[PDB]
Amino acid sequence: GSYDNQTHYRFLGDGWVEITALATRLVHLNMPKSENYCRIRVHNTTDTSVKGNMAKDDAHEQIWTPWSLVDANAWGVWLQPSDWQYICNTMSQLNLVSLDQEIFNVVLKTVTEQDLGGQAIKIYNNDLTACMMVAVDSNNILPYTPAANSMETLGFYPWKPTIASPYRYYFCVDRDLSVTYENQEGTVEHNVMGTPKGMNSQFFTIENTQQITLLRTGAEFATGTYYFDTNPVKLTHTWQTNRQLGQPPLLSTFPEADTDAGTLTAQGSRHGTTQMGVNWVSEAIRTRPAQVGFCQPHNDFEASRAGPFAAPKVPADITQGVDKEANGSVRYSYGKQHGENWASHGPAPERYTWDETSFGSGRDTKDGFIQSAPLVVPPPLNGILTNANPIGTKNDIHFSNVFNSYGPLTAFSHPSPVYPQGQIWDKELDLEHKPRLHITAPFVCKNNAPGQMLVRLGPNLTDQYDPNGATLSRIVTYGTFFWKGKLTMRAKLRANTTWNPVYQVSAEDNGNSYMSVTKWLPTATGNMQSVPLITRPVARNTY
Amino acid sequence: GSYDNQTHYRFLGDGWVEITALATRLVHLNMPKSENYCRIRVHNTTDTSVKGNMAKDDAHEQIWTPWSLVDANAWGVWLQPSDWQYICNTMSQLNLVSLDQEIFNVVLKTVTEQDLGGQAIKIYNNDLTACMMVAVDSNNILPYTPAANSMETLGFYPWKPTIASPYRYYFCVDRDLSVTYENQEGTVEHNVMGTPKGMNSQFFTIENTQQITLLRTGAEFATGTYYFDTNPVKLTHTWQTNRQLGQPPLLSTFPEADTDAGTLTAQGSRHGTTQMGVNWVSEAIRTRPAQVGFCQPHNDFEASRAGPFAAPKVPADITQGVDKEANGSVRYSYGKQHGENWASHGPAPERYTWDETSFGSGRDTKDGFIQSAPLVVPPPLNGILTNANPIGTKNDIHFSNVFNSYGPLTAFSHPSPVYPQGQIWDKELDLEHKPRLHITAPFVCKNNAPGQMLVRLGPNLTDQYDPNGATLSRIVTYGTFFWKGKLTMRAKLRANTTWNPVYQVSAEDNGNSYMSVTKWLPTATGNMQSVPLITRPVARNTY
Amino acid sequence: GSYDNQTHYRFLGDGWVEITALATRLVHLNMPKSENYCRIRVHNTTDTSVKGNMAKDDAHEQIWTPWSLVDANAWGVWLQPSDWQYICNTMSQLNLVSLDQEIFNVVLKTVTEQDLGGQAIKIYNNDLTACMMVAVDSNNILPYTPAANSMETLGFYPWKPTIASPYRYYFCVDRDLSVTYENQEGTVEHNVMGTPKGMNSQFFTIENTQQITLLRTGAEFATGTYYFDTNPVKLTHTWQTNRQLGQPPLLSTFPEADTDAGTLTAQGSRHGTTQMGVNWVSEAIRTRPAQVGFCQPHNDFEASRAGPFAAPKVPADITQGVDKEANGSVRYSYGKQHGENWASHGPAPERYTWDETSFGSGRDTKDGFIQSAPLVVPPPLNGILTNANPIGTKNDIHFSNVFNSYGPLTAFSHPSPVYPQGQIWDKELDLEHKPRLHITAPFVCKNNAPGQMLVRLGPNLTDQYDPNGATLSRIVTYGTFFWKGKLTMRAKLRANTTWNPVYQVSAEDNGNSYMSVTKWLPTATGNMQSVPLITRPVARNTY
């Protein structure tokens, strides 16, 4: 029964900090809309029957459970904006050690109607006998639904009450949606969503799969110390592109003044190795150890059995010919509970394009080209496939949209954790050949995910209860409880090597910069906001 | 000297079955056509000189050895059709522990001619002194030729005598075959098969490489318990595509009746993350953890030093816009000894397109498209590369034939073992960077393959034997022997999680279904057949 | 205080699974209609005074107790539809080991009236002092009333609240109802129900016979581990009829093609034994070891001291001349709490004719006949009593309605447990010569039944309580409590003997088959249903 909410750094020897984060929020649990598990076939035939709207398709089928989950899978739950700044400036890498959770001070209440002055007011009595059910999926039978996807985790301000994210999982049906364009003459050949297949139909109930701990008013619950098995993410970014790996060419002449340029040895009489057949070596055509960053086939919509979906890109830099979509810049969309300014009296969420700090893996899709199989030094008109030639028959789809250049020697940095609206852990997929990375979470658990902590208000019935005919009348209940977490981490402090001062995440004055300190400060009525900080300030050397 | 042929399941604790399969067949060994090793240059100049016939090329060069191999690399040798059904319905995964082999009851006979009634009958005397040679390639010097490729393993019915597959391996020559089309004006520029190169020419004799155990009539041989080091394959299939990973969007309105649909929150005011630049999030464009299944460049014919060959695809689902060739559905072609109906009095084999159960990795190549680098919600005519636009100059080759979308975050399930005509183990290639999977065998041995068991009738000469001039007259011999194998496996029983009844491989009545029980039943004259069963009935959850 | 609801299989050695089922429901206990024991003489003189309505008689006399019983005597309480499928496909037999019960989280509430807006709403306060009474009939003095007879056991879906079945038992009076037919001229000679006889009149109160544990709000109760003594039922069906026992006759000629038939040795020169006097032996008249299945006198209405009742048949197959009533196919009639579709907005229950899988004991009542005492090979007109000759004077009552052919060598299989609406245990009758089987429960307890668990809301009186004059005014109370059970079982895994794939209980796609998976799936509003599964898929060999 303690409201611990602060982070303790415990400096061991050899520069190994043990960051022990702590979080505590008041979760406001409400009664379900129904106590029944039900599959709801979502289909937007008013939005995909228009020609060209295949990216506007969100038609699916989901089992909707009466349970709701307490998901704390975001960094803003555990760390302050000043704690992320102290970690990112000073530590060199971050790892996850353990995760301990707890539920205490369970309080359940009912509502009642009383007439006062001609109107009806609410009366909030206590239930000293009604319970709430806690199920922890420690073996992971149920589907893993992280609430950081729909932005439904716990609130990032410790002094605010939190709602609980309702639990639902995907039921697997068929969907076949035709491919048109923006003003196509004709029709949509297929817009049909199928039936439950007998092969792969999984109806998971929480009751038949979990061991449920009933919590009456005044009871506490605890899951003891899940231990992580993840790989350490790095809090320093890389800058070396493919043209900055190895030894530079030695200069024949040196600059006399500070503004002059140094000339190299001529290309016909220069040493080194190439892979082209020309009898000259330059900085562009050389033999590098590997290829830093690769060319994604950006904005492709693969079509599996469940309808079209955009293929996920690995996030890289948006290099100066600025292309956010061609490199996979994640566009977040969060609410008032997760970082929006509370003075935003609008229905639209606050949205932010996350810019990736790894400057070596970006692909400028306007200065990339492909020449012919022998190398001529000026290529002719038919000997170069530039990024302005139409692929197929149509313009606006050049070769960079279909060129996939992932190879056996492609190296790329792990994508950085965005601080407030991020996601900490994700479980690895149950397929036999698992991907190398997840683009949603920097820590992919190798063995087993921590438990989905599901909570549910137990049903309080009225006296007229007939279990046969068509009705379920129950007393209106709501419950509030405290959740306490404890995320132990393990960081390594930064060594100082370079001469010049490195980049640090400081907070500027009240202006119009992005680290304006008026953001992380409550207003005259208390409207806090959390905007994303930078994760990897200090550069590191790749090679 | 025991005819063990049955499978014993031994249930250990914690649900760990030790399946100990057993096989025994009577192998009918015949005399070779010649005792000489000879390289036979196969070249079909009557079939590839026609324009467009580059997939009809089977021109190569092979060393033909006088030895024949006893290959038991198929599941039908070890398991009954009722044993595969008990394993696939009830176990969750399968692993290989050991493999023990044995050769006993060696019987050699000669033939003779005797005149009876004006015609010549055969007389089958015994050889009590002639031997047969057994070589087991336990160190794997010789080339690894699995006889499950040419469908030449042991017979799948235990009550039938079996022939032995002749041993031959590939000799490495050059082949350059020109690329034409179906009615091209012109000629074939190159249809020449080269000479033995001095660099890579390997002539492997069984005599100079192996230790040969001579088996006279009444002797037995045994290789003691090769121990496997393979990875466990899974007997449960996945259904989750890329649009069914993660948390579903929460519904704003719920369906009133059982036939209504539930509407979601509008896309302009929905939370989550994308990787496109639009200020709305839908189910198609979201940020998934990985990409389940990838886009193969289907029906491409790469041309190495030894002529053209189709690049192998990873088998996936054939999702409802049915495309068996674009996802790599293996087309088997077996004979009367391996699963054809014995009443099929024809020269043509029985052939079956194996359909893959992993429903999440299939790629519908008619509803896949690529848009421009910024995202507009209806794309224009020049802003989408659909699957009906010609690539290059010609139709019927759209972008899906050349789009390779394998990336650093591509996840895909291991392909399932087809039961009767499958292949159990394959050795990993001796290259320095080995592939992730083999599309022919679910168990790739990490250290060393089990031994190629080669057998050969020892030469019985006549009295006029001159080792110099041009002849080798020898007595006509044939031999029959028993082979006994023992394949120990290790399976894990299935946990029951879902509410609804899962899919099971039952046998329907005498009708026209695929699991009609009249298939696995001998006819009025005894014509059995083995058709492929389903390997992964029960679905599992990927994420 | 744990909501365990899942089934654990614990695989011991030698293939002996210990299935430990678990159930937990929220039982909604209501106040009785009166606190008095009262015998209610039910007599439908508006329904049996019509001529011919003797099967429409449900006139009896019952003591109605103020107690209600928590009966968990059905398989749907303990097992999921996917758990029955895993047991029936994979296990060979089933036995009952123990049974442990528990009552916890007892919550009692009253209702009150408050005026709001001109109408009266209900107010549900708590009783922290009122109790509920729990009596467990561990010695079985009271009459054994299984609530699976009137379909009043606990609900089969774990996420639904359950009502408690009211307790009542039969008081023994006389009833004499005359036998008429459908349009008889005359009258009903006797339709009189008698008085309490002094010899056999038993008035059982729960108070004077049981030891009652009072449970106030926050107390728990437990009955410790009743241990069963039942016989194992078999989860594999038989198919061998009386004409498929023993050695077949050897064929003289064999079929040449797959469609030909094999002829036997002629009957005049065939060996074997008969029991007829003819000098020829055929397949019909032979000497079998026993008689599989017998001929019940179907649809007879015996008349004891308490009125007419249908004599119970042993359920057998309904063999192809389909007769469900002549073999005793049990016709179940269940409600919305026990397996009806919840979208059925009707007063009529859902009803299902249970079909028995034992294919060897069925009696086709159209191809059965009786010949004369010596055997002629074509019988004459007066030498055969076929199933079209009238018995007595009237048609529609042939000899199969009165032929009872149970003998000293009649063998018959035990009837199978229907899964959802079944009944698990029944106690054996207290008569000196007990029947061989019960047609309602596969496990008849040899020594002592588990205890009838009776529950009752303790009386809460108002302040004006006079124990003499005619009134009992009490406060309106209702109570909810959790019941936790634990049924340990003991199964044996299936051995695989046959070559062909055996029958398995799979789930087909969304169609119109009986194992359509849309049945075991909630709808868009959550209307689950439980239809009966098959209990004995895999066949076994009788002889």
Provide the CA C384 distance to its chain's centre, in angstroms. 39
- Report the alpha-carbon distance of residue A318 to residue C507 in Å, rounded: 51
- Report the alpha-carbon distance of residue C23 to residue A300 in Å, rounded: 50
- Report the alpha-carbon distance of residue C81 to residue C95 in Å, rounded: 19
Contact partners, residue A334, CB within 8 Å, separation at least 6: A151, A340, A349, A350, A351, A352, A420, A421, B271
For chain A, the first-to-last Cα distance in angstroms comes to: 51
- Report the alpha-carbon distance of residue B325 to residue B323 in Å, rounded: 6
C-beta of residue C420 within 8 angstroms of C-beta of residue C519: no
Q: Do C11 and B256 touch (CB under 8 A)?
A: no
**Other beta carbons less than 10 A from residue C346's beta carbon:** 9
Query: Could you tell me if residue B447 is left (phi over 0), alpha (psi between -120 and 50 degrees) or otherwise beta?
Result: alpha
Contact partners, residue A16, CB within 8 Å, separation at least 6: A490, A491, A492, A493
- Report the alpha-carbon distance of residue B18 to residue B131 in Å, rounded: 37
Helix (H), strand (E) counts: chain C = 2, 30
Contact partners, residue C350, CB within 8 Å, separation at least 6: C333, C334, C335, C339, C340, C341, C344
DSSP class of residue C51?
T
List of chain C residues whose C-beta atoms are within 8 Å of the C-beta of residue A475: 124
* Nearest CB neighbour to B290, from listed A141, A328, A438: A438
Taking CA atoms, A244 is separated from A240, A250, A290, A368, A541, in Å, by 5, 14, 11, 17, 11
Residue B405 touches chain A, beta carbons under 8 Å: yes
Q: What resolution (Å)?
A: 3.3
* Nearest CB neighbour to C28, from listed A34, A128, A465: A465
Contact partners, residue B346, CB within 8 Å, separation at least 6: none
Secondary structure of residue A208 in the 3-state scheme: coil
Place of tokens 């059910």: A133
C-beta of residue B70 within 8 angstroms of C-beta of residue B137: no
- Report the alpha-carbon distance of residue A64 to residue A40 in Å, rounded: 7
Amino acid at the residue A291: Q
Tokens of A307: 């309808």
- Report the alpha-carbon distance of residue A37 to residue B219 in Å, rounded: 68
C-beta of residue A64 within 8 angstroms of C-beta of residue A37: yes
Give the residues across from A108 on adjacent strands: A479
- Report the alpha-carbon distance of residue A390 to residue A399 in Å, rounded: 8
The DSSP string of B387-401 is TTSPBTTBSS--GGG
Angle (nearest 5°) at CA A203 between A199 and A207: 150
Contact partners, residue C97, CB within 8 Å, separation at least 6: C18, C227, C228, C488, C489, C490
Taking CA atoms, C406 is separated from B483, C294, C409, C471, in Å, by 54, 6, 8, 58
Amino acid at the residue A116: L
Residue B413 touches chain A, beta carbons under 8 Å: yes
- Report the alpha-carbon distance of residue A129 to residue A214 in Å, rounded: 11
Q: Do A465 and C30 touch (CB under 8 A)?
A: yes
Closest C-alpha to B369, from B383, B357, B356: B383
Q: Which helix (H) or strand (E) holds A81?
A: helix A81-90
Q: Do B287 and A51 touch (CB under 8 A)?
A: no
- Report the alpha-carbon distance of residue B88 to residue B357 in Å, rounded: 13
Residue B232 touches chain A, beta carbons under 8 Å: no
Phi and psi, residue A426, nearest 5°: -135, 150
Taking CA atoms, C360 is separated from A441, B81, B405, C240, in Å, by 62, 26, 59, 5
Contact partners, residue B203, CB within 8 Å, separation at least 6: B37, B63, B171
A341 annotated binding-site participant: no
Shortest distance between the Cα of C309 and any Cα of chain B, in A, equals 39
- Report the alpha-carbon distance of residue B140 to residue C486 in Å, rounded: 57
C-beta of residue B78 within 8 angstroms of C-beta of residue B7: yes
- Report the alpha-carbon distance of residue B153 to residue B441 in Å, rounded: 14
Residue C348 touches chain A, beta carbons under 8 Å: no
Q: Do B367 and A176 touch (CB under 8 A)?
A: yes
Neighbouring C-alpha atoms within 13 Å toward the C-beta of A456: 25
Residue A66 exposed, middle or buried by CB count within 10 Å (0-12, 13-18, 19+): buried
Residue A183 exposed, middle or buried by CB count within 10 Å (0-12, 13-18, 19+): exposed
Shortest distance between the Cα of B399 and any Cα of chain A, in A, equals 8
Q: What is the CA radius of gyration of chain A?
A: 28
Phi and psi, residue B66, nearest 5°: -75, 5
Q: Do B250 and A152 touch (CB under 8 A)?
A: yes
C-beta of residue A305 within 8 angstroms of C-beta of residue B357: no
Q: Which residue of C has its CA nearest to A66?
A: C159
Secondary structure of residue B468 in the 3-state scheme: coil
**Other beta carbons less than 10 A from residue C433's beta carbon:** 5
- Report the alpha-carbon distance of residue C492 to residue B493 in Å, rounded: 14
Closest C-alpha to A295, from A369, A362, A241: A362
Secondary structure of residue C151 in the 3-state scheme: coil
Neighbouring C-alpha atoms within 13 Å toward the C-beta of C283: 14
Residue C51 touches chain A, beta carbons under 8 Å: no
DSSP class of residue B474?
B
**Other beta carbons less than 10 A from residue A39's beta carbon:** 23
The DSSP string of C433-492 is S--S--SS-SEEESS-PPPEEEEEEPP-B-S---SSSS---B--EEEEEEEEEEEEEEEE
- Report the alpha-carbon distance of residue B509 to residue B529 in Å, rounded: 17
Q: Which residue of A has its CA nearest to B365?
A: A303
Shortest distance between the Cα of A303 and any Cα of chain B, in A, equals 5
Taking CA atoms, A242 is separated from A193, A237, A249, A297, B339, in Å, by 46, 15, 15, 19, 55
Q: Which helix (H) or strand (E) holds B115?
A: strand B98-116
Phi and psi, residue C83, nearest 5°: -85, -30
- Report the alpha-carbon distance of residue A198 to residue C514 in Å, rounded: 12
Burial readout A484-507 (b: 16 or more C-beta within 10 A, e: otherwise):
bbbbbbbbbebeeeeeeeeeebeb
Closest C-alpha to B96, from B213, B287, B229: B229
Q: Which residue of B has its CA nearest to C518?
A: B500
- Report the alpha-carbon distance of residue C451 to residue C138 in Å, rounded: 4
- β-pairing, C131-137 with C452-457? antiparallel
Phi and psi, residue C375, nearest 5°: -100, 115
CA pseudo-torsion sign A128, A129, A130, A135: positive
Taking CA atoms, C368 is separated from C238, C244, C403, in Å, by 21, 17, 11
Tokens of A471: 């009705």
Question: Helix B81-90 to helix C81-90 angle, to the nearest 10 degrees?
Answer: 150
- Report the alpha-carbon distance of residue C534 to residue C516 in Å, rounded: 13
Secondary structure of residue C380 in the 3-state scheme: coil
SS3 content of chain C, % helix, strand, coil (to 5): 5, 30, 65
**Full strand arrangement of the beta sheet holding A350-353:** A350-353, A331-334, B272-274
Phi and psi, residue C94, nearest 5°: -140, 140
- Report the alpha-carbon distance of residue A433 to residue B361 in Å, rounded: 12
Amino acid at the residue A92: S
Place of tokens 């079929």: C255
C-beta of residue C227 within 8 angstroms of C-beta of residue C208: no
- β-pairing, A291-292 with A410-411? parallel
Q: Which residue of C has its CA nearest to A208?
A: C6
C-beta of residue A365 within 8 angstroms of C-beta of residue A359: no
- Report the alpha-carbon distance of residue B183 to residue B168 in Å, rounded: 37
| Elucidation technique | cryo-EM
Give the residues across from A132 on adjacent strands: A215, A457
Phi and psi, residue B539, nearest 5°: -80, 155
Taking CA atoms, B321 is separated from A307, B74, B362, B363, in Å, by 11, 32, 10, 9
C-beta of residue A162 within 8 angstroms of C-beta of residue A337: yes
Amino acid at the residue B187: T
Residue B500 exposed, middle or buried by CB count within 10 Å (0-12, 13-18, 19+): buried
Q: Which helix (H) or strand (E) holds C90?
A: helix C81-90
- Report the alpha-carbon distance of residue C481 to residue B283 in Å, rounded: 43
Shortest distance between the Cα of B523 and any Cα of chain C, in A, equals 6
* Nearest CB neighbour to A208, from listed C1, C80, C117: C80
Angle (nearest 5°) at CA A456 between A452 and A460: 165
Closest C-alpha to A149, from B279, B280, B245, B268: B245
Secondary structure of residue B376 in the 3-state scheme: coil
- Report the alpha-carbon distance of residue A494 to residue A449 in Å, rounded: 30
CA dihedral B499→B503→B505→B506, nearest 10 degrees, is: 70
- β-pairing, A162-163 with A16-30? parallel
C-beta of residue C45 within 8 angstroms of C-beta of residue C35: no
**Other beta carbons less than 10 A from residue B193's beta carbon:** 19
